[PDB]
């Protein structure tokens, strides 16, 4: 054969023309929305969010966008009295070169998991409006992650699920508290909502409070057969002693008369999802339209509308799926 040699050698004052800016290099090398927001390319970032996760109402993103934009580039003076320089810090800075750079990571997944705890505390002390706000911020923040491996993509998706569960649950409870309790029929509706809240997947400390609420309401209704099962599930989560005792007392009173007084719209042995807009159950086989980012379930009347949970997505739009890692572009 041969070696490593056996190309083409080619053929006033003019001001030079600009090269590509480092933010454009960013947009070229990345399909993740946060990188485009760091670059100042809001429109291509919005395109990515719309196609990947279904955002159409971007208003509630303004804070996240602007603040993200503000962390994108550093600045330093060169010669005195002249406009300052910008620096464009890259996450791959060891080997970015001129053409391959992609911006530093400013929001890490564990920052968000840490904010979860303040959400949980807010919920526990009962500040539902403020917990929902903090939860929604985590939810909308998740598509701005940059994330290394497949397990972190999994965790981020679980995080979105957690924020959703809490948002729809607290939304249900907040609406139940706004409803009148005069009519018997009005009270039946309130109990229904408390029973739906029971089927949210929260942390045991919070599911104990929702079962306590449901147990009280179904006991006043004299639906002792369903109330008894709420009591048994609450006892099985292992509440604090005083609540366990009050609960055992209510349970033996339910079993000394195990009859439900009214037929409510709540199936105990039948899985459903809670319509996040009308707060009625959608039973496991029936038609449902979903939020493409959070997984909020909606009755089909609402397809095309703005998801009550995320507040920025289109119900039922088909989308690529969340993208928050280089992995997802093989």
């Amino acid at each position: 054969g041969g070696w490593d040699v056996e190309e083409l050698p080619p053929e006033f004052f003019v001001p030079p023309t600009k090269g590509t800016s480092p933010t454009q290099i960013w947009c070229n090398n990345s399909q993740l929305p946060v990188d485009h927001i760091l670059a100042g390319s809001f429109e291509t970032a919005m395109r990515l969010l719309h196609d990947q996760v279904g955002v159409i109402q971007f208003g509630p993103y303004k804070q996240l966008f602007l603040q993200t934009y503000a962390r994108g580039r550093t600045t330093y003076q060169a010669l005195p009295c002249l406009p300052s320089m910008y620096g464009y810090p890259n996450r791959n800075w060891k080997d970015a070169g001129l053409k391959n750079g992609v911006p530093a990571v400013g929001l890490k997944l564990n920052d968000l998991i840490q904010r979860l705890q303040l959400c949980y505390q807010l919920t526990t002390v009962g500040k539902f409006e403020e917990a929902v706000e903090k939860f929604r911020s985590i939810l909308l923040s998740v598509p701005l992650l940059v994330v290394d491996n497949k397990q972190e993509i999994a965790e981020a998706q679980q995080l979105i699920t957690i924020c959703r569960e809490y948002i729809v649950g607290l939304s249900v409870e907040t609406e139940r508290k706004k409803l009148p309790k005069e009519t018997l029929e009005q009270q039946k509706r309130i109990c229904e909502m408390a029973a739906y809240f029971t089927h949210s997947n929260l942390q045991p400390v919070h599911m104990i409070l929702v079962l306590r609420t449901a147990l009280n309401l179904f006991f006043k209704l004299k639906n002792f057969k369903t109330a008894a099962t709420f009591a048994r599930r609450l006892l099985e989560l292992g509440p604090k002693p005083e609540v366990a005792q009050q609960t055992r007392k209510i349970l033996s009173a339910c079993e000394k008369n195990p009859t439900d007084a009214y037929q409510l719209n709540y199936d105990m042995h039948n899985p459903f999802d809670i319509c996040a807009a009308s707060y009625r159950p959608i039973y496991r086989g029936k038609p449902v339209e979903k939020c493409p980012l959070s997984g909020a379930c909606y009755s089909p009347e609402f397809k095309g509308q703005i998801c009550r949970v995320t507040t920025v997505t289109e119900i039922g739009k088909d989308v690529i799926g969340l993208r928050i890692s280089p992995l997802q572009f093989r």
């Binding site: 030079p16 719309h50 934009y69 600045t75 010669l79 009295c81 002249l82 320089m85 070169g97």
Partner: protein, 292 residues
Amino acid sequence: VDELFDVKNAFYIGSYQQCINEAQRVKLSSPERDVERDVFLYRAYLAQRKFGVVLDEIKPSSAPELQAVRMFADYLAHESRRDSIVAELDREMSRSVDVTNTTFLLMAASIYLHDQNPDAALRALHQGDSLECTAMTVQILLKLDRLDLARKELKRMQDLDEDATLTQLATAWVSLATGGEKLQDAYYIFQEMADKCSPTLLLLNGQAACHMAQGRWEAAEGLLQEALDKDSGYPETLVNLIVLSQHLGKPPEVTNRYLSQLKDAHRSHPFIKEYQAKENDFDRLVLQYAPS
């Protein structure tokens, strides 16, 4: 050896008051050097935004180099006059310029850069032969994202005087734009000038930007806090602190305090205007995906 070494050194690293102090002490061993000293003295008053000193003391009988400094000062002080000054500058250049008067070319190019005319500024600098002219070309070329051309001009300064302050500084700017291993290089240049002279706001933020480019946010926090203690109004510190805050996981209320503090930086850094522009860009794109 140059009698004005310490004076020019202090000026270029941003140590303006030390420059002014040392200029008023040196002995008049020429009339060439005499005018050169006065040029840096008034450029240092310019850097302190004390335009009144420059405007009142440089009279129509003053040397041509001082007339160029006072031209620049007139521009910086009087927003209403800027477009007319630029116009007259355009005519001067089209007519005839003393090309050996590098002080005039540097003042003209300064004015052009502020009037957002890098082409005109480079065209003026091209006519001159001096170390600061090359350095200012290196800077403008870096702003135009032409790292290749900047490398060539830097190579010129390196062949002519490796140990010069302007050459070190240009090396650091080129390194900061090159990234990679070269970032550590920039840091030590900045550090070595701070620990020969004095740690100025300019050098503190140079070092800070080197650390932040390597992702070493905690290492940058000390430098930025020191810069913040020296001068609560220097904008580059405020901007860098925004970036650093977010990379240290601090609450959005901190980024908001720095953004509000930047509206009173009373030094004209473009960041706030670009920010408000991106605010308007966002509002408009919101109305594009949902025409309310």
